[PDB]
Each structure stands twice: as C-alpha cells, then as structure tokens.
C-alpha cells in the first residue's frame, strides 16, 4: 500500500550494496528518467545519502514529476528542485491501486494559497477561503475543503488510471562512504603510481604507509589549498598518504 500524493512517504537508505542495473533493465517500468547523472554510470558512485519518495498519481500527471513543471500536482502536492540529482521511476498499477466502484483512499490537494517549496510537505486540513468572506470552519460559497479524492476505477481510460511513482534522490555532501554499486575491493598496492578509488574518492598517485594519527572519526586528510593527501582504508582502517 503506497501513500497518497499530498502526504508522501520518504524512506531513507543506509549503508548497503545497491544494484541499479537490475532496476534500469526491469522492462516493467513505464518511465525511468534520471536527471543529475547518466543512467549507465549508476553502478560505481557512492551517494552519501539516498532518499526514496513513493506516492500514487494519475496517468496524465506523471509529466509534472520533473524539475520546473506546472500543474496542480507540481504547484502544491510535490515540488522537485531545479538542480535535481536522482531518478524518477513510474509504472502503471491498475491491478493493485484501483477497484470497482471507486477507490477513494488516494486524496490530493487542489486548493492552496501559494506554491510549495521543493521537498515541502503540507498535511494541513484547514478550510480554504476562495473569496473575501471568512467562514471560520464551515463550507459554503467560496469556502472549500482543500482535499479532493481520486476516482480510481479499472474501467478508466489510460491517463486516468493509478500510476505508482518512486523518486530516488542521491546526494554527495561530506560523508566518508555510504551505499554504492556492487564492486570488487581488489587488493591494494603500495609504492607504485596507481589509479585508485577509495569508496568514492577517485585519484592517482603513490600510496604510502602513514604515521598521522587520524582521530577515530576522521575519514580523510585535507591539505592547505585543499587537495586530498591522506586516506583511510575502509577494510583495515589504516591511514595512507597519497604522494603524487
């Protein structure tokens, strides 16, 4: 059971091994659009933090789940920032989220004073005031209940049928090493100009045994003028200098 679009769910991914190639080639998704990265380079990146937003919308409102869009879902239900990094996955779910006579468990907001911020969530249920007259907790002329309900019936045209949407969002803030595609931690070497990758840190140089006491909580070493000059090996947890 997914959540409604006006109060959407947000699952946060933790340290893992993620395989996005089995998602990109599942042949069951109606829309797989990545925005901040090419899809084929998904298996090799280490996103400090991954979030997943899951909800249910209509069929002709999937094109509003994109950075910089207009419409009632785009204005105030779910807003995507213009500098997006994750992907949008969307698939038809008429067999699951619809039933005969109408499935009214999926409400959406169609009245709000202002547009939403990106990643803003408005679960308020105040009575909207369309006109200049206040009504103070009752309906009437130009006083509306802000949440309508989707009428989901399986005898609907395609474009009025329930589409399940999952929006993945990746970010690379300051973490030391989080989730990441499946890779083989090939044996490390020393004292040779090498091409290395330390759970995200990509570089080149000679690796050497260190003697700098990396405080139990310091992922790496920063040098004035800001160039990486030390790392910590994730598996054995020892500090190594990176000479060029």
């Amino acid at each position, epitope marked *: 059971r997914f959540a409604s679009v006006y109060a959407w769910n947000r699952k946060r991914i933790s340290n893992c091994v993620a395989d996005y190639s089995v998602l990109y080639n599942s*042949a*069951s998704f109606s829309t797989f659009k990545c925005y901040g990265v090419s899809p084929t380079k998904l298996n090799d990146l280490c996103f400090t933090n991954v979030y997943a937003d899951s909800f249910v919308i209509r069929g002709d409102e999937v094109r509003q789940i994109a950075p910089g869009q207009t419409g009632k879902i785009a204005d105030y239900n779910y807003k995507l920032p213009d500098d997006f990094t994750g992907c949008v996955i969307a*698939w*038809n*779910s*008429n*067999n*699951l989220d619809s*039933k*005969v006579g109408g499935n009214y468990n999926y409400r959406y907001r169609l009245f709000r004073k202002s547009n939403l911020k990106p990643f803003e969530r408005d679960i308020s249920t105040e009575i909207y005031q369309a006109g200049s007259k206040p009504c103070n907790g009752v309906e009437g002329f130009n006083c509306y209940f802000p949440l309508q309900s989707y009428g989901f019936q*399986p*005898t*609907n*045209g*395609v*474009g009025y*049928q329930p589409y399940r949407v999952v929006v993945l969002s990746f970010e690379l803030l300051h973490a030391p090493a989080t989730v990441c595609g499946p890779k083989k931690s090939t044996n490390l070497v020393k004292n040779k100009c090498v091409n290395f990758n330390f759970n995200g840190l990509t570089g080149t140089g000679v690796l050497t045994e260190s003697n700098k006491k990396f405080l139990p909580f310091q992922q790496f070493g920063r040098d004035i003028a800001d160039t990486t000059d030390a790392v910590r090996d994730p598996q054995t947890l020892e500090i190594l200098d990176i000479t060029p």
Partner: antibody, heavy 123, light 108 residues
Framework: EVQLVESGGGLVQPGGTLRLSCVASGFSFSNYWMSWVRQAPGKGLEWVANIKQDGSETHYVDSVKGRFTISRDNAKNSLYLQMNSLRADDTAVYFC????????????????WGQGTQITVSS | DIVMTQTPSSLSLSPGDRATLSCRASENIINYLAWYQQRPGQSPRLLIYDASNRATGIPARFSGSGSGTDFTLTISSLEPEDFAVYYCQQRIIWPPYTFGQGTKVDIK
C-alpha cells in the same frame, strides 16, 4: 508440465443448474488468478469470471451477474463455477485458464489454458 | 467497451512465406496486448504477451510489437501447424477483457 483437467459440462433445460469443477496439478495452486473463458460454437472467444488466489472480487462480465458464481478450494487444488437459470444462450465451450504470472502487477494474461468442456442448453 | 478489430479476416498463403496480422483498438491502450493461436481441434496457446515479448516454449518465428492503436503479429515462415486462428486481447481496461475476432490463415 502444467495440467488443468476439468469436468461437469453436459445437457440441461433452459432454467437448469450446472456446476463445473476444475483440478490443477502441474504448477502450485493458489497465488494464481484462475479464470473461466467461454467460446460460442462458430464464434470468437469471450470472458466469464476470475477471482483471486483467495476469495475476493469475483468479477463477472455484466451480462451474466446474479446467475453465475465462481469459487475455489486451495486444499483440494480445485476451482468451481456454478450457473443457475441458463438463458438458452450460454451454450459454449468453457475453458479453465491460469494467469501466466505470480505477482499482481503483470496479471491479466491468459497463459496456459486447458482443454474445454461443452455445455448445451436446449429442450 | 473497447472494440478490438482484426482488419484482415482471412489470408490465403503458401507454406514457407511470411504472415502479417493487424489488430486495431478503439481506444489508446499502450503495450498491453497478447496474441493467442487457436489451433484446429486444440486448446489456445499464448504466443506473445505484452506486445513484442515472447512466451516460454514459443519458437523464434513469431514476432510482435506496437504501442498505441495499431498492433502487428508477424510469422516468418509458415510451418504446416501454423495454419490456425489468431486472437488479440487487451488487459489494461477491465471488466470485461475483450478479444479480437479471428484471422483464419489457410493454405492456397
């Protein structure tokens, strides 16, 4: 291999009552959305009903409702369809149909039909 | 509710050539169409499910595709068992699940 044996069809009067049974062996009963599909003699195929891997949303064809009833039994690996007040136009060949897949999103495809039984309604 | 239509009714052919069959919907379905082969005196058999995807145990002579209103099944070389009736069926708009009408391919 998957086998879908079925029985119960025959000859009855307009206004009679029949009950078709259907036994499944090859796959693993339950989880599969079993169905029933008729075909008139000398015409194309049609559709009758389908239920669940349980009992829910029996889902008839709206030219039949109130006269047919589809049910199942997972312990006996059996599927039943009962017809009352036969309207002298439900003379056809009826087929037990499996549903080609295991999970609900890709259901709806009539994978692995069975051989059909014949029902004639006359006097 | 959806009136599926098979635009040729019968194709006279010779064993060995190709065979094209067209199914046209009355409403925009997308990718959700299957093709069944009613053999003479046998139970029907699912050839392709989901438009261009073949089912298990089906040889590579059968191909399909589409994504809207027009759909087409193609048989590369007619084996002598392939002279049968062919039905197209949608599954996105139910109840009811509507079939086509049949395209009896025979020998000539």
């Amino acid at each position: 291999e998957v086998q879908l044996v079925e029985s119960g069809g025959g000859l009855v009067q307009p206004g009679g009552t029949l009950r078709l049974s259907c036994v499944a062996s090859g796959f693993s009963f339950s989880n599969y959305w079993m169905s029933w599909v008729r075909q008139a003699p000398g015409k194309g195929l049609e559709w009758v009903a389908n239920i669940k891997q349980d009992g829910s949303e029996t889902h008839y064809v709206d030219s039949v409702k109130g006269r047919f009833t589809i049910s199942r039994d997972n312990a006996k690996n059996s599927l039943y369809l009962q017809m009352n007040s036969l309207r002298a136009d439900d003379t056809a060949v009826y087929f037990c149909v499996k549903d080609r897949t295991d999970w609900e999103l890709i259901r709806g495809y009539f994978g692995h039909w069975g051989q059909g039984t014949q029902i004639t309604v006359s006097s | 509710d959806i009136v599926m239509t098979q635009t040729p009714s019968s194709l006279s052919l010779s064993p060995g050539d190709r065979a094209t069959l067209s199914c046209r919907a009355s409403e925009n379905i997308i990718n959700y169409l299957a093709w069944y082969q009613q053999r003479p005196g046998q139970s029907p058999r699912l050839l392709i499910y989901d438009a261009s995807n073949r089912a298990t145990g089906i040889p590579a002579r059968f191909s399909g595709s589409g994504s809207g209103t027009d759909f087409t099944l193609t048989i590369s070389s007619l084996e002598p068992e392939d002279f049968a009736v062919y039905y197209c069926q949608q599954r996105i708009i139910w109840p009811p699940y509507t079939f086509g009408q049949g395209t009896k391919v025979d020998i000539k």
